[model samples]
Target: NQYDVIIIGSGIAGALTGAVLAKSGLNVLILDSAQHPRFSVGEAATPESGFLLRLLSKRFDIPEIAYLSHPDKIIQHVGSSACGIKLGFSFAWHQENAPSSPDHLVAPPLKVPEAHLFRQDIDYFALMIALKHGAESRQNIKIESISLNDDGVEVALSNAAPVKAAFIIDAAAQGSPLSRQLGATDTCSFFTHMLNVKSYEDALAPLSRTRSPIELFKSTLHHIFEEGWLWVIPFNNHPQGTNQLCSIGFQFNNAKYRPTEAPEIEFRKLLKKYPAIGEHFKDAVNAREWIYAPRQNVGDRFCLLPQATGFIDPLFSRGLITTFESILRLAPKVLDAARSNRWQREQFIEVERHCLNAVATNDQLVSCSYEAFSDFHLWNVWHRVWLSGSNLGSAFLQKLLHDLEHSGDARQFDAALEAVRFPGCLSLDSPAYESLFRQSCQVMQQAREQARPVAETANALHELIKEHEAELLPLGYSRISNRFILK
Candidate 1:
């Protein structure tokens, strides 16, 4: 009777969703098995994460959530716990190229610095904001955990009070009572551990010997390996005295990069093999834990944030972004449900599609990324997909959240910026993105069949990028000052 909405697992998804729903004046109670300020591993941010966050914050009127959209803004208003500025997205394809050729480090020309978050701080900050916005939170609450009522769901939290709300949201990823009860498989290869990992500026010295130091440190740097690519997210790249820690881990194909003993041990061993990776973390310490990573085989709208439902891998820095997107979509459905107290799951049908589409789209993006590792020439194509898709998404989201009349419907805006389309380089409206996606897919096929040299196909991508300066300006966060022709 006290709560209108019950959200379990108070992590980023639940908290952000609760924040927005609470802003709508519903009595939202966020229940979590764990407490706030807990450590979380997904710490990187792409420009799209930043873009969506900004739109959600303004649209929902939650200033604290808005703080996260910019790294410096969080630091200026909150504290220094937020991670480093993601000046750009940089990559080095391991073993495939002569060092000079494939080591491309670039970003959109947004002039603003994107962030690498310290998710512990980010999640905690968000939850606090949710509370401030009228969401009641109870921590250390255990449960049976939930049962469906005729018009609402009943919650049984151990060691505390029970709750009956018009609806329930299981923000509990992997640990979700509903997902686990329904047998969502932990099939995908994803593992995360967060502690003080190394962020030695000098570790990048070998690469920086030729490249710019500004680019290396102020970026979400990827060290592409034969089997998987490791992400380097610097929380303390600044010269100012700080934590000096960064988040580092590889999304490995289990067929290729499976472990020997401890996950950290295999990580270091792989490093020794790849001098580029090894040189960067030679003496890095490991405060690590290995948990069973789950991917949603498939599930219900009333079930997961989908992330809560399951995940395939963590490559695109899509964690918080996906959560917020689902929340924004879900908010309208939820508010509409309140008037009649009929919290029917199908009312949230679009949210179901939003969750389903996320899985399908990210599955495509991740699978293509995995395939590109076989060759460095395809790497350029992949990066363009990365760039173009990233641009497509950030641009589309910016439009959806802020400029909807100009933005097309969900089909037009929400389609994954296919790695093939180089989404950031195209307008992505009616005829643009779809047309480009098909054409680019053909190019990728032809290049694969002919076994074209990386450089020749790279020229094709480079030409595409040169043609899209105006379209890309708002899509990404950086561009190589010399190579990119951006305003």
Candidate 2:
């Protein structure tokens, strides 16, 4: 049918975008090939995502679902352990560390409470319900397929009349028919990894304790291994009355390896390498169902001009965060064009470039970080030490020192670690950790505020590293200092 705007796909990305546009009092329609509450992978949201949901609730005047749920309830409903909520995430990155010891070699879970672990079932369903309610409440919006035209877009329904709209948003993900018809294609080179996650119900008894509801086993060697990782999540009341779900999967870097056959076999092989997971499931039965997605196609690069530009990568649970941010940043421009009855081709082009650039930069940082941490022996040692510490303040200070003394090529390393660790740090609450983390962020802010050139910033960052080193070394935190500073 005809409308002011048409959005393809009803996944989180589409649903969120549609919700925002419809909430803004604009006539918006959303069409999807799949139905709601369908079985989709990536069932958990990161701490940052929890914070994003809170932000969206405030921005759209949508009710805060954050209070209606908790990490335990989410875990029970989704049949997975919700660990991220215990961390203090509040919509942005912060830093901190834990004390160093052999027992503490694995990073401690963040203590932040603002970030709640979520089951996709509850959160996605809630979001969909809200969007549907909001959109249906609006008399101007409709949801149906449409035909395209040179002048504008056209919509038609089966056994029904056709409708039209001024613009269309092809949020249908990779291999999207609408996207293909519009000549938008997935950039193969840009995405070259696949993450296979398998959930098992029978593996919970050995991992859970009475007092602590959730537990995470971080392999001391996680920083070095690129094969895959395992997550053992304890649900309060899983579908089969199980207490937890175990997700085991590997991220295959296309540059180094490619899966030539069924991914399950590769996953099985990788699981065997980790004695903890292997032993935990020695006699346990497979849950018989697993989830798989090739990382490359999880997100799509839209083909339309600047106003229509958007791309996302589903690494480190940044999918929801990026999607929310994109709608927040781009919806205004899209609606402004619709309101003015004008389309600025150049502005749209610029937006497209910005989206592509963001995606490219994010993907590169993840890829590089994965490769670097996987390959570098020394970095791995420092990383484990950092994660194992008591607070991020000391760990971050140590990391900064390590970067300055050895590599001096901190961009890739810093970005990669921050991408993963920032969410962890922000999710946990430790006043000491937060204070130190804020200090580091302040340093970054000062660097930006100084308007230093790129090269100058790099050099200034080294100075900041030195400053952090001086602070930490005096506290007898010379493990990193000793490694970096040659006596």
Candidate 3:
């Protein structure tokens, strides 16, 4: 059988991409080794993810895509039990006996309501939307091999005859048969969703109480420590929330802590080490197998989705944002190729470039974050850098989308994206943002490698932000002594 496009995974990336292309009238086919309603991670969402969802929905006239743009929209369109509301990025610095306040902070609430996606439900819904748009899908079908050429792609399957397409998108994550055949790199992360995870409001010790603009439970909460951090994402954090499961995971520096035992054992040891962390997850039981994963790359007639390409860490929840961006950039190319029937390897360069650059940026951000985790003061400054960059990037997206909405000009949006002139989400159309990120990464890495004092490194970072105070002044990080910053 022949199709205009073939996607080798029915995950959200593949499903969403197929939905867009199929909606555009392409003869699309999506294949997956697993059936629908499967368990998966990458559950967190950011403002950029929501904005891109809105962008795709508007640009392609796909209301199904927009239904996932915010928490309320997700509940209204999907179900109240399908996802979790994310008000902001919430962090709590934890030490065994030390109190949590001075370093604990909640980022200002996002102007765009974000969500903690329940991937099982969301992915199934997305695949159905793709199918509804005339995309064909098959499940539990193994992809034996994939051959790419100047003309198109030939996908060999174990359960059926070979299928041909003008293009192939590998959203199969790291174990992609196509990626392995193409010799792509293997790398990804650790995470799992479980039930009965005690809410921070209840599990937090008396000493952990701290005032915030909103309940920390209403956001994707992070418990930061010296070695690594634990993520707490609840599916029932809002008044309309109906899901009972919570997502939890730990990421530690390899050089600092290596796992010699099972995930459960290591997790228990970690909980014992940090009683504060233990309190929250004590009664929790995993709903699925614990995944200690390795994490992504892109190519020609064939391109890997962002996750299939690589993932640095989930510290900033950049995974979904990057995936949405890759789809945003890739869908247009797919539609063009479908129309012209030209499958040049060079046609997908932007997607490849963005994937690589996003990974590099996330690597720098997460590495600096791990380095900063060793000290609270260092983390505080770095946190400001992170929040400022996130806020600026979010503002850029919001304004661009606003302009596009007002003008109803797709070319203007494309031009705005082109003017960015750089890959990755952090430094879109801002040279100052780029320099700040560079200096921040450099100073943190230098501190780690050269054994610089924490205060010196922290102050150096503070000065870097101060240098861009005009740009970052609104974020309230220019004054280094200020611990609590609010918009």
Among these predicted structures, which one has the highest TM-score? 3
- Give the lowest summed-lDDT range of ten residues in model 2: 87-96
Query: What tens-digit string does per-residue lDDT give for candidate 2 at 145-210?
Result: 445554567755555466566776765455554544453112211111122222221332223321
lDDT of 3: 0.79
Which has the better lDDT: candidate 1, or candidate 2?
A: 1
Cα miss at 90, model 3 (Å)? Answer: 1.3
- For model 1, what is the error of residue 319's alpha carbon versus the real structure, in angstroms, after optimal superposition? 2.4
Candidate 1 C-alpha lDDT tens digits along 1-487: 5688788777777888898889878999888878877877777776667776766676566767777887778777556756677777666667633442323433333456777777787788788888888999988867776666465667777766678877677776666676655541122233454444444345544444434434566777776654777777777765431545667666666655565466666666666666666666555655456443423322222446666766636666666666666776667667767866665556666666556656655665665566566556556455665556556666566666555334534333333322122222223343444444445555555665687765666556555555553444353322433322132
**Predicted candidate 1, C-alpha RMSD:** 5.6
Work out how many backbone clashes candidate 2 has.
37
Alpha-carbon local distance difference test for all models: 0.62, 0.41, 0.79
Q: Record all residue pairs in model 3 with backbone atoms less than 3 Å apart, i.e. clashing.
A: 187-294, 187-295, 188-294, 188-295, 296-309, 296-310, 297-309
- The full ranking of all candidates by lDDT, starting with the best, is 3, 1, 2
Model 1 TM-score on a 0 to 1 scale = 0.80
Task: Mark the regions of model 2 whose C-alpha exceeds 4 Å error after superposition.
Answer: 65-105, 114-120, 136-151, 155-163, 184-224, 228-244, 283-288, 295-315, 346-354, 375-487
Which segments of model 3 are wrong by more than 4 Å? 96-106, 183-190, 205-208, 294-299, 481-484
